[PDB]
Amino acid sequence: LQTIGVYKEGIPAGLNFVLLEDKFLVLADTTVNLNPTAEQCAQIALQAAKIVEYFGIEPRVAMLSYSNFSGAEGTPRKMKKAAEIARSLRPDLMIEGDMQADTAVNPEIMERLFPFSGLKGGANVLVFPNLESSNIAYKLIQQIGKAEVIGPFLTGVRRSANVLQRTTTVDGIVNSVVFTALEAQYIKEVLKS
Amino acid sequence: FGRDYLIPKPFDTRVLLWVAPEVAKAAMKSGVATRAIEDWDQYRESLEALQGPSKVFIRSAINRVHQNSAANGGELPRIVFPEGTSTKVLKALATLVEEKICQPILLGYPERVKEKIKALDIPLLNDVSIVHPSSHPKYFSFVEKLYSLRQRKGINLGEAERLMADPNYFAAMMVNQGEADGMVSGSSINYADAVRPI
Amino acid sequence: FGRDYLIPKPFDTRVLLWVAPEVAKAAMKSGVATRAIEDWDQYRESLEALQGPSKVFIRSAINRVHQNSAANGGELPRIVFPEGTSTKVLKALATLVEEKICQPILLGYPERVKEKIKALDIPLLNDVSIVHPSSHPKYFSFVEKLYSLRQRKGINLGEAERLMADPNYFAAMMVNQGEADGMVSGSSINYADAVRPI
Secondary structure, eight states: OOSSOBOTTOOOEEEEEEEOSSOEEEEEOSSSOSSOOHHHHHHHHHHHHHHHHHTTOOOEEEEEOSSSSOOOTTHHHHHHHHHHHHHHHOTTSEEEEEEOSHHHHOHHHHHHHOTTOSOOSOOSEEEOSSHHHHHHHHHHIIIIIOSEEEEEEEEOBSSOOOOOOTTOOHHHHHHHHHHHHHHHHHHHHHHHO | OBTTBOSOOTTOTHHHHHHHHHHHHHHHHTTOOSSOOOOHHHHHHHHHHTSOHHHHHHHHHHHHHHHHHTTTTSOOOEEEESOTTOHHHHHHHHHHHTTTOOEEEEESOHHHHHHHHHHTTOGGGTTSOEEOGGGOTTHHHHHHHHHHHHTTTTOOHHHHHHHHHSHHHHHHHHHHTTSSSEEOOOSSSOHHHHHTTO | OBTTBSSOOTTOTHHHHHHHHHHHHHHHHTTOOSSOOOOHHHHHHHHHHTSOHHHHHHHHHHHHHHHHHTTTTSOOOEEEESOTTOHHHHHHHHHHHTTTOOEEEEESOHHHHHHHHHHTTOGGGSSSEEEOTTTSTTHHHHHHHHHHHHGGGTOOHHHHHHHHTSHHHHHHHHHHTTSSSEEOOOSSSOHHHHHSOO
């Protein structure tokens, strides 16, 4: 961070992949920012969407909360306002908040209870309101969900850069390198333009 | 009026207003009067005002209600009273209606309110419209207009359904939609609790 | 059961629970069997268990309700359900009683709930206590006890009468006083809105 830095409007953020039979879900930010502000949550999400768009998949984003659209003072307002910012920045993308978790990932719950929601087809990008929720969520899916989880990976830096954990296994080190290489190629291509 | 009530009670405030103008009327018709009262309404008005600085103010006010009412087609403003079974509200409606101020619309069970109307022996308003929320035709039209207003403020479709089931929110929505011209409530509930729906 | 229902629907989860144990019972009685099932109840329990690692848990639970139930006189915990016209609560209760878990007390207008019991073709529970708050004898004893618990927290004698008229508060107060052993609601209301009176 002290040497490479981030690009314009960047935020340093740790991201995971949850792998299912069909889709995968993207989790963030799980290592870096302790209690991210609304502006920050919208940026975490936007980056996560450039990343999912890279794999040719339509990104669907939920600002997670303990509430279904309360806008109430506190976390819900931060996340609701967060989504509002994120749409302000990329209007082609399906982004919403605030909403609970299950309300996110399941398009059926969404159409039954909040048919007004701009998010349909179930979320594929989950932004957390803070670090407690995201680290506990990802490590809990990994241990109980019995769906497979890779990461965490680093995002938002000017150049291809990535941090491992000490607990990282060899598999982890090699796929982590893969992403590093790719983002590097993506950097070169952004350069070409 | 009957075998046990033949003459108005000694402490009846109406007494002055009813007898005095007829005494002046007789003193004039028989011609022993030396100064003529023409506007009978004005005489009575000043008779009322004659006791209470507020009354004259309120009397001026009502005069202004009638003034712009009769200038816009003789129409009376529709006013919603969510508390249709409220004793105090019924008793007020009583004195109100002979004043032709507004068209009162009460809320509650169509019969539990005429039950309370007949219970207070106040037949002045046997015919003022009384509406139960859950029964009104525009009811779903209403629950959705609330929904869009509060679906992002912690309300899903179900809670907006019961919330429009509350006479208060019902009054307010009625007003908002022009299905009523005004509302007044809270003779039963706390100022805060009653203001929140509005 | 009738002319339009002669056989259990193909998809009854009870089928197995009812048929398989009697098949085994027959095979043991007819002597073609080489292993004997003794704990019949256990057998059925395992049969339910077949789908549901949670289902097994609630069954452990129920066996354990029956266990201290039968130790204190077979007495069942009295439980009040304030939302007595809730489709879901009623339908749940149905399955609840034949498991002899609790003695259900519903809240609302007695005939407006027996209407919904007859409306749901759910005769399982034709004999459960149905109580209107305002009508119950301890009502006033209750509004007084709410009064002193909350008069210095924003409640006059009137507001306590009208809040005790809310089935929720009526329920909770039933519980606090020992007129019931517990309560459950929030099948109709927001989590918060339903947790506060408690």
